[PDB]
Design an enzyme around this catalytic site. Sequence first.
Site, mmCIF file in Angstrom:
data_model
loop_
_atom_site.group_PDB
_atom_site.id
_atom_site.type_symbol
_atom_site.label_atom_id
_atom_site.label_comp_id
_atom_site.label_asym_id
_atom_site.label_seq_id
_atom_site.Cartn_x
_atom_site.Cartn_y
_atom_site.Cartn_z
ATOM 1 N N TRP A 89 13.108 -11.181 -12.086
ATOM 2 C CA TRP A 89 13.362 -9.896 -12.745
ATOM 3 C C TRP A 89 14.853 -9.634 -12.977
ATOM 4 C CZ3 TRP A 89 9.846 -10.420 -8.658
ATOM 5 C CH2 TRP A 89 8.498 -10.300 -9.037
ATOM 6 N N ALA A 116 -4.576 -6.366 -7.452
ATOM 7 C CA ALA A 116 -3.653 -5.758 -8.396
ATOM 8 C C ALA A 116 -3.406 -6.768 -9.492
ATOM 9 C CB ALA A 116 -2.328 -5.413 -7.700
ATOM 10 N N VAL A 120 1.531 -10.199 -3.631
ATOM 11 C CA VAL A 120 0.117 -10.584 -3.532
ATOM 12 C C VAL A 120 -0.079 -11.949 -2.856
ATOM 13 C CG1 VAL A 120 -0.720 -9.213 -5.497
ATOM 14 C CG2 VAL A 120 0.102 -11.562 -5.884
ATOM 15 N N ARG A 168 14.171 -5.159 -18.711
ATOM 16 C CA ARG A 168 14.706 -6.403 -18.162
ATOM 17 C C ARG A 168 15.983 -6.715 -18.932
ATOM 18 N NH1 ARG A 168 10.270 -9.643 -16.731
ATOM 19 N NH2 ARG A 168 8.615 -8.337 -15.834
ATOM 20 N N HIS A 189 9.290 -3.488 -13.813
ATOM 21 C CA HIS A 189 7.842 -3.606 -13.957
ATOM 22 C C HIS A 189 7.178 -2.347 -13.420
ATOM 23 C CE1 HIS A 189 8.047 -6.050 -9.898
ATOM 24 N NE2 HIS A 189 8.631 -4.867 -9.815
ATOM 25 N N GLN A 235 4.086 -2.630 -19.906
ATOM 26 C CA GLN A 235 3.165 -3.343 -19.032
ATOM 27 C C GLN A 235 2.027 -2.406 -18.652
ATOM 28 O OE1 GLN A 235 5.616 -6.604 -16.270
ATOM 29 N NE2 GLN A 235 5.355 -4.469 -15.599
HETATM 30 N N1 LIG Z 1 4.877 -6.988 -11.784
HETATM 31 C C1 LIG Z 1 4.962 -8.418 -12.267
HETATM 32 C C2 LIG Z 1 3.580 -8.905 -12.760
HETATM 33 C C3 LIG Z 1 2.487 -8.702 -11.730
HETATM 34 C C4 LIG Z 1 1.892 -7.438 -11.551
HETATM 35 C C5 LIG Z 1 0.941 -7.219 -10.552
HETATM 36 C C6 LIG Z 1 0.573 -8.277 -9.717
HETATM 37 O O1 LIG Z 1 -0.351 -8.071 -8.689
HETATM 38 C C7 LIG Z 1 1.144 -9.550 -9.882
HETATM 39 C C8 LIG Z 1 2.098 -9.752 -10.885
HETATM 40 C C9 LIG Z 1 5.975 -8.595 -13.411
HETATM 41 O O2 LIG Z 1 6.805 -7.678 -13.660
HETATM 42 O O3 LIG Z 1 5.882 -9.687 -14.048
#
Ligand SMILES: N[C@@H](Cc1ccc(O)cc1)C(=O)O
Lengths: 785, 157, 159, 266
Positions: free
Chosen positions: D65, D230, D177, D120, D94, D134
């Site tokens: 990121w 998630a 995760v 970003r 995100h 997103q």
């Molecule tokens: N947040 C991540 C993408 C993502 C979202 C949720 C998740 O459980 C896993 C990955 C990104 O900015 O790319």
Amino acid sequence: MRVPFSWLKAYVPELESPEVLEERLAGLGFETDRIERVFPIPRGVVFARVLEAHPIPGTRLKRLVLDAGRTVEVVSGAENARKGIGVALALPGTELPGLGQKVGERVIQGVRSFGMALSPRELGVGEYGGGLLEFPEDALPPGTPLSEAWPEEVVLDLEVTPNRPDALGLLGLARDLHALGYALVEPEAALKAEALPLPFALKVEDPEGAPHFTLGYAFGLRVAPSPLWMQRALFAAGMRPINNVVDVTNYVMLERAQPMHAFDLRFVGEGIAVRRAREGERLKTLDGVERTLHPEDLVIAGWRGEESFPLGLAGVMGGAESEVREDTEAIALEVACFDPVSIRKTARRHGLRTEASHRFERGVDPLGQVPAQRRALSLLQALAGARVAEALLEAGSPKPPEAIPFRPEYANRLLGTSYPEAEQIAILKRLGCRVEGEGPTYRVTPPSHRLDLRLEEDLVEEVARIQGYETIPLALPAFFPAPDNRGVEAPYRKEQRLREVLSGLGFQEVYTYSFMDPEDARRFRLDPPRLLLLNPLAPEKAALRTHLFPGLVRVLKENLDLDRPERALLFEVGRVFREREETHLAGLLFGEGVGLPWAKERLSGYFLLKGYLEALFARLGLAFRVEAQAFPFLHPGVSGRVLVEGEEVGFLGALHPEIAQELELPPVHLFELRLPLPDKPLAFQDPSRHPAAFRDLAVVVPAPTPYGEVEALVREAAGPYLESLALFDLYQGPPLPEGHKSLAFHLRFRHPKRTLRDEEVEEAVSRVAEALRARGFGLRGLDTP
Amino acid sequence: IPLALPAFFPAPDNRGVEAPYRKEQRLREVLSGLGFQEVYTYSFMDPEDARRFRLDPPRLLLLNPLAPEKAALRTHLFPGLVRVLKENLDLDRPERALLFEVGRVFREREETHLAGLLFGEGVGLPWAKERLSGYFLLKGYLEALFARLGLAFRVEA
Amino acid sequence: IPEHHPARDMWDTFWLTGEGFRLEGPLGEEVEGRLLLRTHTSPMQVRYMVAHTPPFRIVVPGRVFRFEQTDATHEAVFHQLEGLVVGEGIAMAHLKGAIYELAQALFGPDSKVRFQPVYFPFVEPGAQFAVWWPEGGKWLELGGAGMVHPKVFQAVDAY
Amino acid sequence: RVDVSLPGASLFSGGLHPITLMERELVEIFRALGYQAVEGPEVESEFFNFDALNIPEHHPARDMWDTFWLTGEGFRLEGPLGEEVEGRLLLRTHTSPMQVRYMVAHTPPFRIVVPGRVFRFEQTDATHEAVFHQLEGLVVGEGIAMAHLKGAIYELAQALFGPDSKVRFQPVYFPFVEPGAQFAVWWPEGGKWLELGGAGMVHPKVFQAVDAYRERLGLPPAYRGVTGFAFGLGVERLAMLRYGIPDIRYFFGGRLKFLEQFKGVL
Ligand SMILES: N[C@@H](Cc1ccc(O)cc1)C(=O)O
Ligand SMILES: N[C@@H](Cc1ccc(O)cc1)C(=O)O
Ligand SMILES: [Mg+2]
């Protein structure tokens, strides 16, 4: 159905109270519309014995000599007032419901009436006011307060759904409460019968209508008033006691959903004949109404020698002539099961709805007759001192109910519960079912009185309601829906968006009845309606609308008479009927228009509507064109058809002047389309980065030629590089050849990959002047800056 | 790993949790239906525009901007709307334009704004000349919006 | 729901007439039979089932008609919302869950639902449900429901 | 008489932005599955954007990121319970931080979806933006398993590309995760696999961060005996493939010729 608490309590002794009883019946499937306390009787009202009745000479009144503890005298005008009966005496000073005028001692036609004898209406126990209450002469010790033998009662107004005809009997209800766990007390019919021949015969000429028919024989009858407990019970249930025999039949009917009628043998002749009525055949029914029977009416008749005569309208109402009265000594008792549909038609046919018909229409225990005969004959023996014959006359042999396969596992699976098998079996047993086998699938054969138990599912509802719907847990289902169910909601969603955009664009939604006035096909100049109503609410609503705008025009009118709207932009979406059921969208414009409230210039009429509509389709991303075309309900000069995405889907214009006038309405503009609107898929067109070529030019055209045709031509030939094309000015007059007009078009060209050479643009306008003239149109301006 | 779908009654404090989001969505939809064209603009702001558009200076600034033109976080929505009006007038030559944008703004606290822009000759007959435009055309559309939303709308000097 | 069935009375029907009308069945076919204004949205659950396959969840809003006298709380023309969820393992516990969710969604966390047996020729068990309305402090009798009747599934697969 | 084919009053006709359309479809798809939409703030704290999500400083994972760091006094960032939160400010990279905010403010079980503008530090080209959108998903509760995550995405695909659509999951890494995964959906028309987003089972340390912040706020723990999944998916990429938009840059371009092209789209 009226449910007298203390009466029910005689079968279900442990009932906690009317409130708890209401609760219990609710969980069983019976809703009570209301609970009521009903027999308040003041202390002033006492039981009295009529020692003698003396008519007052010159009047139609009688002087009653009553034994009421001490001998008192009262004056009455009641036809039934007579010696030998007990009566309800309101002593002077008594406060009576019916009157509100404190009862007193008064002089009537020469005699001092010490209070007065009462009718059901005066005491407040029934609506009947045409005669005195008649009690057994020994019901109570003279002078005792009636209260002491007639306590107040609480009555529940119960709803009994069509599936539970067994519940049209207080004992039927008792059994449901029993299944819940309450002790059940069934009345024992103690009969002391004697073996001897019945002095009459039974001949069922129509077994279709009378599938099971029995006749009881009771003689040596002593007709008199019913005991106080029975009159109390009957009154609470909404019925009026008449005497021993008659009351007993009504009481049993109410106890076990089994209508029955006692025929005085004097009129029976040789025998009873259950047959269809011969056309013309007359019958004076119990209500005193003289009737004429229809060949489809099932009749209970008698015959003497070579003559057959009607005695009662089977399963609906007995005849007036053979009604059991004081001098009756013997009867033939009718306890039967009649064909529900037959009773249904006869009942309607004559405008009758009785306690009897109602029960026969909903269904009667196919094998309850004999047991019902014993209950009744037993009561007749006990209250009318009747001698009863051992045998009955029976015709028909209904078959018992069949076994129903039952699976405790399925019941629990269908309900989402986990009741232990044993509890399930026990419940079904408490409801009188027989259960055989040892699982996992049993043979459950229901009682003949439950017409509603035929399928396994039926049995699972029995377990559920006795266990209690509140014992069923809450859960949510999880599953991937079958493929053919995807997007199934697109159609509905599409129309919803449409409505929402309309309401956002500025249109006010309106709902109008689907009905149409046949006469409006005339008024609004429309082809006649294809679907009509056989049973309309009124002739104004006798047809099914074919258009949406007529109703919109009528609401415009009604809104102008109630309130005085200055403007109105309406819309309605609705189903229309013509050849096929289809969905339409109609809109209505009316009023001064849009502009500054303080100023005066305004936008309105046709072009205001065509304006809003152009936005709608711009918003919807669909081509919207309006060509000229005539419509019976539209002004010939302000009328055109609508072309969404190239196909004709409706119209637009001003309401015909003549129509407007007949309706007393200012000019009205409107449209109507057919849904769903054409659908145009996205075809993203990447916009060119390079500049666009601007060029103007006017077109010389005759006043008749419609704008569209020109614009279509200008565009059509403007070439494959045309970006825009807008009419920025219409002009007709000098120096143009009168009857002619010029169309100022704002053109714009552009090329995706690169910029456009002046050679290509010049050519473009040229290719236009080409056909522009080939059609007979000039060029007031060319290559204009 | 098999495919499955979960089943459960959501905990109480999760009810109506989507009202806020739904509310704003309806707003956008009514705007697009009333006649407004939605527009999306970068959350960034040119510090120099605080001057150009006469606005108090931006409170949040970027330590690592994409360029000095995008070195701050917008405080108003209209400046960007005015700039797109300009860019749309240089690329293509729109005669009119009724725009709207909903976006997060930054000043003291992060807040959500709704801005609209009117421009052009106005509304009326293409061939005719009389027209409705300027201030009162906008105040017109706005009065409808709030009539549509069922809210009192007044405009004091 | 037979003819000259007591249950027919639960619906006062507007019977129609007129030739030239085309009523299309679930699969676009030409259906026949005496025409009338639907007395409820229920027929739609039969149409949907012949045209689709389980499992599924549908809701069908709609204008309905009953021959009745128009007063303060009664109409001859009104609307109903039908629900139908069919599939392997679907149980009455799920029906109750649905309505529980309806209530919560409509009247808040302090809302409650109540079920009592009631009759409908198209369900068994049959039931009426009421939802607790905390503000008005009272039970509102909302609608009927139950497990789709065996004979309904049979009619569907026969058609 | 009147020419009826003559143009009418030029009443304006509005429209919705492509992203608003795509986001709305996504939100609808998931509403049908019981998810509710909620939003978070564009300006976040490093705590919520990174630390609470198991993403340390000078952690290799931080590099996934490129962050816009902000500055300036007088700004009030409010936490989940309205409190005054602190920490280095930045533009959220995100929507993930929102799942931490929601959890401290609510109790399981639940289903949420949070659309949102993200930032970003990157170079703007034909298929890359510094400012994009997103859609995050979060379902927590007793018994929630990866089988459910897969079911969700299966439904997303079917809903988006029809019955002949398919989903594909492959292990991938995310500090928040474990298991972690990337998923692609089969697009029958374009005949190709589209890498849609990441996902997995909420990381133990995330639930821990949530309940610690709750206690630090006086709230009782609520995520001790539950699990959840998630996911996160880019909107522009999807919007592009779905409307046939060639340049990701058009979204924030503001060009009417472009925007106007989506008036029809519902
Ligand atoms: N947040 C991540 C993408 C993502 C979202 C949720 C998740 O459980 C896993 C990955 C990104 O900015 O790319
Ligand atoms: N009306 C009848 C009651 C009844 C009606 C029909 C029957 O078949 C039997 C009894 C009576 O007065 O007795
Ligand atoms: Mg039953």
